[PDB]
Design a protein around this nucleic acid. Structure first.
Ligand SMILES: [Mg+2]
Ligand SMILES: [Mg+2]
Ligand SMILES: [Mg+2]
Ligand SMILES: [Mg+2]
Ligand SMILES: [Mg+2]
Ligand SMILES: [Mg+2]
Ligand SMILES: [Mg+2]
Ligand SMILES: [Mg+2]
Ligand SMILES: [Mg+2]
Ligand SMILES: [Mg+2]
Lengths: 67, 90, 80, 199
RNA sequence: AUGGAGAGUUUGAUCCUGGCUCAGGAUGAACGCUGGCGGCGUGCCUAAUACAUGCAAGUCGAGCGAACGGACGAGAAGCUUGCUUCUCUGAUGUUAGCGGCGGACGGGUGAGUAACACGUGGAUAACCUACCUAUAAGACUGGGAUAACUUCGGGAAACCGGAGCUAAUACCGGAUAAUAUUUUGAACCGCAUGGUUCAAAAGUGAAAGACGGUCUUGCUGUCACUUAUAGAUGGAUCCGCGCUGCAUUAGCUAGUUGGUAAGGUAACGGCUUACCAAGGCAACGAUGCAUAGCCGACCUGAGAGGGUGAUCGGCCACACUGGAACUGAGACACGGUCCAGACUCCUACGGGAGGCAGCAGUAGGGAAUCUUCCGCAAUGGGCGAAAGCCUGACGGAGCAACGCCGCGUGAGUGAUGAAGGUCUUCGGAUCGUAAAACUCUGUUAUUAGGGAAGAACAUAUGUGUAAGUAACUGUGCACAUCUUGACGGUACCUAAUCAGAAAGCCACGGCUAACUACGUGCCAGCAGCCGCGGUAAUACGUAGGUGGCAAGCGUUAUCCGGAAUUAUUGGGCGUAAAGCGCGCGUAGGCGGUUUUUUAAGUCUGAUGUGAAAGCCCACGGCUCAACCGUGGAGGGUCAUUGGAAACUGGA
């Protein structure tokens, strides 16, 4: 993180375009299954791309309105 | 210099002034010595005015000097004439 | 005209020259539990003639600063 | 109005004629949607309180924020909270115009007041949220004194409550006094809404 | 009386205990999707990080000399009487400079500060105060300089020197004046120290002129000047009480605590020094460490409480870092000075310069916070006699759904249940009066016209009246008139045209309102908790429908609530977490019955104060509302004072 703390962040949605050195936005909220994963990566912010093919609850996955 | 002046209240494009005795160095809308009245120049197409004559005369005798608008307001209320008459006939 | 605060208290030390320390006792109430609890405050007062002695109940009155920490003057010895 | 939706579907959902005619419930008195027919589930207590609140809110054609604010201000009045809330909802210019009968529908009266065909004490009022008070008069704009809709609604002689005194010749109504619970619709249990806003 | 809801989850099942979690409210928010408008607010919380550039403090010619400038209007005719020089007059004006006042306000910031910093209540017989107001008395008589300017010399610049000359409301001597200082006497009074008044004397310094009127240089108006005493304002000091975490911080203090003398200060004082003494603080938490600007208030809660200290007001502190003083009524001074330090810049390399936590803006940091805008028209401030100048205070506009409030995205009729989507038991059901179509409206929007208030004034011009005058001009007051708008041709109003440009977000297993079909098949994926998904998934993704909201809806972060889960209100310790292994005993806490007395607690009345804004109640004004305004009510463990004696405390 920008404060030099290293964390594990879950990537929500189906399919992602993230690799090493990608710049991502991280919010709170742990994944109960994953022990040491205590944060989430916001979709549709900075490098992270929106979920492709998502149509319901798009704002939660950073997908634009298809129209 | 003690002075009698208008401190602004109300809202944007809707001023409403309180008439206050305050030190000249104090901020406008800030510390005051004592309020004596109110002055609304946007009421019923005629400036509404309220003043306490006793306090106005006390401060005029003490040495507080009004501003232009406060002097006009006190003249309209007749306080200036009474102060002048008392000073002349003291 | 305007008077100055006067307190009554016991003398708890007089080793200083012309100075006696007076312990005024009060009872502040606990702000949450409301119980009465003792509160002592020591006052440094001027004793010009060293009349007051360790133990006697004396009376003090507030004055202008007289020393680094003396703000009171002995008025009378209520008891002894 | 602000909610531009199927008032028939809303009436069917809430089991009440928002228009007051009953046409919506005449044929299909059950809820809309794929599961409308053969619907037999039982509402919980929260569901019942919510349904009562929604009945009143959609009856008066208001949004949730304004409805809640009106309920809050009514709570500050002296008396029974629910009755005060109901009379305050009745006092709205939309409700007053609709009761006077210058329109055949509450939404139509809302559009009239919004477009400014109404005057209160002889002055224009564009805001349907306006809260009328006893002793005031509601008139109609001269440029719109001969509107087909308004004249037809006036011709249809509807009942005028006691708290309103109307004269159709001048198209002039008067808000005489505050309404009463009996005058206000009895299909609403205001205690349920009070409890809903309690939790 | 205005006020208080619970639910899921430990088991095969149960009751209890117990934590975890959820439903509410809030925000200077950020992010994701989406996004029409108006009104009122709010908008660098991070780096007290560094800052390009512009602007944020000047004004006074009615204090002063000088310079520039040149009307009105002189002289010769160049025979051009329309153009001309110097031998003039030279007015309306402008300025670099001396001098006065203002640069100590206004604006920014919260680093430091755990402290009489702040809040509340008091005290100063220990204090200071320019400008302002009132009263009284004065403003007399002389003098020496210097800036500017001219000249010579040295500089890239910053700018420097030497010589010569000249002003003042600049500076200085003397004269008279004191409630100020010394001494003596007297009168009265108080909270130790002391305070007020009177009478004698001795020492003793103040000042200024400018612009006008009458003109008799005599009188005199306004402003300005000096001394004294009061008022007002502002500031200073002291004190009770309140105001934070840690003992895995227990000792701290040597000018330290007191006295004497002196010095010093507006002022008292170890404030400082010399001497004498050994005192002072601390388990009622000293010292140390950590963190922090404090408050009015703000959020939440039924309350008690808990959390916070943005915007606005008060108080404090700071101005690259540290120290110091100068000038001044006032500073140890944000856009002053000196010194030291870090950092940065310019240079002709000789040497010079700077401090945005002012308004914009740049770079950087950050999840994140705006225009290098307009005007002094309003209010306020500085200077000026005034017009007026200055004013990034302020008043406005610009941007941002950041918040709150208001209005839209249409309304009536409309079964003939149209097409089409989804489901189906293949009959139908549903989207659905929804749609289509007819009728209506123009809030909004486009076009074209009209168009506020906010503006009071000041000044100037006319009169009237009042103190003074010997009388005017003037001065105070009163009534009239010309003129003054950045916003802005904006708000608002009118007329015409069109439903036409203006709906999205989340959710639908229980909590919790809302269910079905396909795809998938412990995978992909969901998830706040319990959990869901391995072919019949209302829990994953899509679709139809439905629910909640709606120009917003969700997510994340943080605070209060629910949590009686630190329990004063309002919990416990046999077996759930919890009685020290047990004595002896210090401080503290608590304490048997009666009588008298005190009034510290306790109870009751009066007075002052608890700013304003805010919350609550009422009323009034914006078309409504938010918002704005005005009254009321509230808020102290507050203080002074008078009363009662049952209980606790004292005798
Ligand atoms: Mg700090
Ligand atoms: Mg509670
Ligand atoms: Mg300065
Ligand atoms: Mg600066
Ligand atoms: Mg700045
Ligand atoms: Mg960045
Ligand atoms: Mg609690
Ligand atoms: Mg046990
Ligand atoms: Mg035992
Ligand atoms: Mg108040």
């Amino acid at each position: 993180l920008s404060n030099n703390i290293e964390i594990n962040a879950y990537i929500p949605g189906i399919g992602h375009n993230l690799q090493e050195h990608s710049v991502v936005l991280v919010r709170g909220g742990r994944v109960k299954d994953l022990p040491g994963v205590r944060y989430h990566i916001v979709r549709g912010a900075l490098d992270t791309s929106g979920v492709d093919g998502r149509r319901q609850g798009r704002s939660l996955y950073g997908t634009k309105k298809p129209k | 210099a003690v002075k009698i002046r208008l401190t602004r209240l109300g809202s944007k494009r809707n001023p409403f002034y309180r008439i206050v005795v305050a030190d000249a160095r104090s901020p406008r809308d800030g510390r005051i010595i004592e309020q004596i009245g109110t002055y609304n120049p946007t009421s019923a197409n005629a400036p509404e005015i309220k003043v306490d004559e006793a306090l106005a005369l006390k401060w005029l005798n003490d040495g507080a000097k009004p501003t232009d608008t406060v002097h006009n307001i006190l003249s309209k209320e007749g306080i200036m004439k009474k102060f002048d008459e008392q000073k002349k006939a003291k | 005209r305007n008077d100055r605060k006067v307190y009554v208290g016991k003398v708890v030390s007089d080793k200083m020259d012309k100075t006696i320390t007076v312990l005024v006792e009060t009872y502040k109430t606990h702000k949450l539990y409301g119980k009465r609890v003792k509160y002592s405050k020591k006052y440094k007062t001027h004793d010009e003639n060293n009349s007051a002695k360790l133990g006697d109940i004396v009376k003090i009155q507030e004055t202008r600063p007289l020393s680094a920490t003396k703000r009171f003057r002995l008025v009378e010895i209520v008891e002894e | 109005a602000r909610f531009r939706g199927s008032n028939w579907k809303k009436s069917r959902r809430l089991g009440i004629s928002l228009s007051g005619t009953g046409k919506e419930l005449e044929k299909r008195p059950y809820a809309p949607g794929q599961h409308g027919p053969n619907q037999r589930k039982k509402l919980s207590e929260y569901g019942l309180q919510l349904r009562e609140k929604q009945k009143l809110r959609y009856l008066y054609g208001m949004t949730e924020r304004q409805f809640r604010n009106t309920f809050d201000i009514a709570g500050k009045k002296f008396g029974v909270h629910g009755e005060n809330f109901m009379i305050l909802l009745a006092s709205r210019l939309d409700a007053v115009v609709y009761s006077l009968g210058l329109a055949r529908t509450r939404r139509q009266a809302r559009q009239l007041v919004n477009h400014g065909h109404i005057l209160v004490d002889g002055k224009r009022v564009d805001i349907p949220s306006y809260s009328v008070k006893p002793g005031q008069t509601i008139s109609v704009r001269e440029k719109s004194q001969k509107l087909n809709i308004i004249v037809e609604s006036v011709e249809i002689n509807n009942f005028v409550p006691e708290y309103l005194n109307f004269d159709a010749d001048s198209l002039t109504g008067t808000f005489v006094r505050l309404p009463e619970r009996s005058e206000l619709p009895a299909e609403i249990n205001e205690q349920l809404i009070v409890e809903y806003y309690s939790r």
